[PDB]
Design a protein around this ligand. Structure first.
Ligand code: DPN
Ligand code: HG
Ligand code: ZN
Length: 257
């Protein structure tokens, strides 16, 4: 099975998923001096007031905080997006050390972790159909740096003990994702893909420039999770990030000047 190790990591993914060497793969390095302000970009709208979280799951490569997307309760619109995208789940990518962990990089700088809020275009009916379209998904990427603790993240941190191993899940209702957002919504955007197999190229990426700060204690809890299942030797869940991929024929646009 694919993973992040020496024998099953990102450099091996192309064998089972040829698109790994595709034309619009993610993540990418965001060269701030090459990105251009785009006046055509509309205001970004993040409406998470009615968000309904339901469960948190350790899927063997990260943990997903799942939401009820049977209706428009938590949606992302505006910006480079046409239409409405519904929040289905969010997860993170982090490192074994604070100096690495993010997937996207800014002028080659790696952050301690990166949050991905995944949304699907409602015009396609369901997530499965959306990932078969070039404009099927919109992922809001948020960088995490180590410093002061993030109050809105503690609820996630404290429940990780109950889903330490692969396959474990726990009820996780009433979690407000608004507490994970930085102050500013300034962002960079480009067309890309899922960063984990099947690496489908159906994502409009919206990466916020302002990182949120989390405490060393909070990130350390992330690093206590396991890639392995219960009853198997312990493999700490760390460095579950894919490196930057070639930008190729793409242009990264900035929402700010
Ligand atoms: N990256 C998908 C795993 C995944 C699917 C759906 C939700 C979250 C994660 C895969 O491993 O096949
Ligand atoms: Hg696609
Ligand atoms: Zn991700």
């Amino acid at each position: 099975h694919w993973g992040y190790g020496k024998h099953n990591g990102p450099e091996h993914w192309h064998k089972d998923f040829p698109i790994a060497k595709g034309e619009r793969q993610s993540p990418v390095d965001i060269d701030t001096h090459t990105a251009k302000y785009d006046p055509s970009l509309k205001p970004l709208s993040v409406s998470y007031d009615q968000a309904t979280s339901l469960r948190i799951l350790n899927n063997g490569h990260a943990f997903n905080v799942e939401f009820d997307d049977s209706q428009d309760k938590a949606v992302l619109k505006g910006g480079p997006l046409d239409g409405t995208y519904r929040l289905i789940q969010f997860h993170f990518h982090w490192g074994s050390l604070d100096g690495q962990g993010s997937e996207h990089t800014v002028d080659k700088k790696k952050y301690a972790a990166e949050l991905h809020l995944v949304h699907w275009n409602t015009k396609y009916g369901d997530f499965g159909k959306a990932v078969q379209q070039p404009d099927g998904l919109a992922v809001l990427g948020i960088f995490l740096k180590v410093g002061s603790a993030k109050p809105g993240l503690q609820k996630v941190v404290d429940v990780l003990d109950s889903i330490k191993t692969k396959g474990k899940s726990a009820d996780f209702t009433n979690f407000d994702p608004r507490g994970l957002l930085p102050e500013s919504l300034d962002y960079w955007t480009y067309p890309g893909s899922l960063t984990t197999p099947p690496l489908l190229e159906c994502v409009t990426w919206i990466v916020l420039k302002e990182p949120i700060s989390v405490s060393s204690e909070q990130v350390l809890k992330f690093r206590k999770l396991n890639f392995n299942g219960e009853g198997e030797p312990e493999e700490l869940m760390v460095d579950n990030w894919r490196p930057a991929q070639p930008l190729k024929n793409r242009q990264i646009k900035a929402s700010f000047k």
